[PDB]
Amino acid sequence: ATSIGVSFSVGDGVPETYILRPVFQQRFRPSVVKDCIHAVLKEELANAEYSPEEMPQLTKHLSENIKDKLKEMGFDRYKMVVQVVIGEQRGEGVFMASRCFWDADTDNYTHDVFMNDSLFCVVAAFGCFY
């Protein structure tokens, strides 16, 4: 068995005349980011056996690969953070909370889940404008 609980919340207000706002076609698109992430996870992890000792470097490999894929999606003027969490399948599961103090009108996030016989994985990605 494996229980996974992931939540997200945002603090009030925006951290601090004119403002710049992102153009729609270049915004951080959660639906697109999800499809990139799952493609990376499927190719790199599909059902290959991973020992526990392989997992610490595996997380960095996935985070770097996902980050590099997102850099070529046309998301202009967005700083991006990708966090990868992996647990061994023998475990009961994992629980995660994300909270941001940012601009809720421009910035967005994704949470995604992958599992195979060796491990379960959680990917959190964030995009902050400008």
Partner: protein, 104 residues
């Protein structure tokens, strides 16, 4: 001013202690615990007054002999932006908190 890692690191450690310090793992509270950690951590970060937009994540796993692994990769300005990660552990659970500061 700047993202001071040891300044953030002490904030994270105290936030973890305030939320789950001295508690054994309870299934009935784990989601409440992760939310409490990021809530306290972010609040103490915003009180520094520095010009950052913050991302804070907390991960909790019950100890079964199974391991917990994390990593982060970013695409930002390394001259201005930074991150702090604390791995906390007691007899019954792991807790990993990552805080990212993105200058504006």
């Amino acid at each position: 001013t700047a993202f001071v890692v040891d300044e953030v690191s002490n904030i994270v450690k105290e936030a973890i202690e305030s939320a789950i310090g001295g508690n054994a793992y309870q299934h009935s509270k784990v989601n409440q615990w992760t939310t409490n950690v990021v809530e306290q951590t972010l609040s103490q970060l915003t009180k520094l007054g520095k010009p950052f937009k913050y991302i804070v994540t907390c991960v909790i796993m019950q100890k079964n002999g199974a391991g917990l692994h994390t990593a982060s990769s970013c695409f930002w300005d390394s001259s201005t932006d930074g991150s702090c990660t604390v791995r906390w552990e007691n007899k019954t659970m792991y807790c990993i908190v990552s805080a990212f500061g993105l200058s504006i």
